[PDB]
Design a protein around this ligand. Structure first.
Ligand SMILES: COc1cc(-c2ccc3c(c2)Nc2ccc(CC(=O)N(C)C)cc2NC3=O)ccc1[N+](=O)[O-]
Length: 258
């Protein structure tokens, strides 16, 4: 079929380089095109991925020095824009987005991939508001040949990073993503980030360890999701709740949404 390979770039989605919304000349199918050694790793990690809650990779095209990444277009935009500042969103929406985020994170960890930059800017929504984990540019293999490798590189965004990443030379990959999912859940339910970074020098972080939940953002959050956040936002990564136990949490399994 002629012209089926021709795509028109209609608008900027992000600007590493840039991301454009591409529309097929013949079929009018919408795709996102990312124009850019972490790019070689991004393509490699993306080629491994196939899950309903992970942005689908269609392929890559190399034209000289510029790399083109063909990715699933999510028309609902970013989860970030569904969070009303200082309010959040209705608890049933947050629970559904959290279920989908757990599905995507379980999938990634199951194949030995850690995203390392989970935040609402990297959680995209399709036409039916289905959450998709986006941008594997900071992602890495933490398990290979059933052997876990401990991480040591500083990756992520300070309000979302786990405290071990700032205190320890080495750390397990999975508790780090579990923590950032708890900061995402906090943002969805309170419309604010609890601290600039998880360090004792940070007063807001010290208050949380002291269990001062009568303060913001915690006072805007119901006791059932707050009990879950008490299990996720645990400083010791070895004592922090794992995803199998998050799936057994009372609020996680609370019927809320129609
Ligand atoms: C994979 O790496 C990246 C991907 C994106 C990106 C890719 C696709 C979308 C997106 C952002 N967000 C995005 C933002 C806004 C909207 C809706 C909207 O308001 N307009 C104007 C189209 C849709 C999308 N849809 C996407 O599917 C943005 C930045 C990066 N990056 O930093 O590398």
């Amino acid at each position: 079929v002629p012209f089926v390979e021709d795509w028109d770039l209609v608008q900027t989605l992000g600007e590493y380089g840039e991301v454009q919304l591409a529309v097929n000349r013949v079929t009018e199918e919408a795709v996102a095109v990312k124009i850019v050694e972490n790019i070689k790793k991004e393509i490699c990690i993306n080629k491994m991925l196939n899950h309903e809650n992970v942005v689908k990779f269609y392929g890559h095209r190399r034209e000289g020095n510029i790399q083109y990444l063909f990715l699933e277009y999510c028309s609902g935009g970013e989860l970030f824009d569904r969070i009303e500042p200082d309010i959040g969103m209705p608890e049933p929406d947050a629970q559904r987005f959290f279920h989908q985020l757990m599905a995507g994170v379980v999938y990634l960890h199951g194949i030995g991939i850690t995203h390392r930059d989970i935040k609402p800017e990297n959680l995209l929504l399709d036409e039916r508001d289905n959450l998709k984990i986006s941008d594997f540019g900071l992602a890495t293999v933490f398990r290979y040949n059933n052997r876990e490798r401990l991480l040591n590189k500083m990756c992520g965004t300070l309000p979302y990073v786990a405290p071990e990443l700032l205190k320890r030379r080495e750390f397990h990959a999975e508790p780090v993503d579990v923590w950032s999912c708890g900061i995402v859940l906090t943002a969805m339910l309170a419309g604010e980030l609890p601290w600039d970074q998880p360090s004792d020098s940070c007063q807001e972080y010290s208050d949380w360890k002291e269990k001062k939940t009568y303060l913001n953002p915690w006072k805007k959050i119901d006791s059932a999701p707050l009990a879950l956040l008490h299990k996720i936002l645990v400083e010791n990564p070895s004592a922090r709740i794992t995803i199998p136990d998050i799936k057994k949490d009372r609020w996680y399994n609370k019927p809320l949404k129609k």
